[PDB]
Design a protein around this ligand. Structure first.
Ligand SMILES: [Ca+2]
Length: 139
């Protein structure tokens, strides 16, 4: 034991003038966690970058308020991808899978394009905080 040999504590701490009487046996720990409930805040990150995708939208020349998927495919093709990433970008951006993309569907299309550009591919998941207004629905 501690007689005939000095029993040193694993961490040698010096409590100068502090006679410590830690009552052992109770165990617990809880900090003030910031609880975020469903406050009425519905704003997908595209509402603030749509102007970019929408300007390119009219820049590629849309028809009847949406781009023919042809030009949308051009856009995501020049985004420098194989048909693998490209195909799943299309099917992850176009919720209806029309063969076209409206101003918001380009918004998503190009948004996921810059998401893959972040250095990570798309996970084939479509979150309710990234679904264009027309498709605000979890089914
Ligand atoms: Ca669509």
């Amino acid at each position: 034991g501690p007689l005939g040999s000095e029993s040193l504590m694993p961490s040698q701490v010096v409590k100068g003038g502090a006679f410590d009487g830690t009552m052992n046996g109770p165990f617990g720990h809880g900090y003030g966690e910031g609880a975020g409930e469903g406050i009425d805040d519905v704003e997908w990150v595209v509402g603030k970058d749509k102007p970019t995708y929408d300007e390119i939208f009219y820049t590629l020349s849309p028809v009847n308020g949406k781009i023919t998927g042809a030009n949308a495919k051009k856009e995501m093709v020049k985004s420098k991808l194989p048909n693998t990433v490209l195909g799943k970008i299309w099917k992850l951006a176009d919720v209806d899978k029309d063969g076209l993309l409206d101003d918001e569907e380009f918004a998503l299309a190009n948004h996921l394009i810059k998401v893959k550009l972040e250095g990570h591919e798309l996970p084939a998941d479509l979150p309710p905080h990234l679904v264009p207004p027309s498709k605000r629905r979890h089914e």
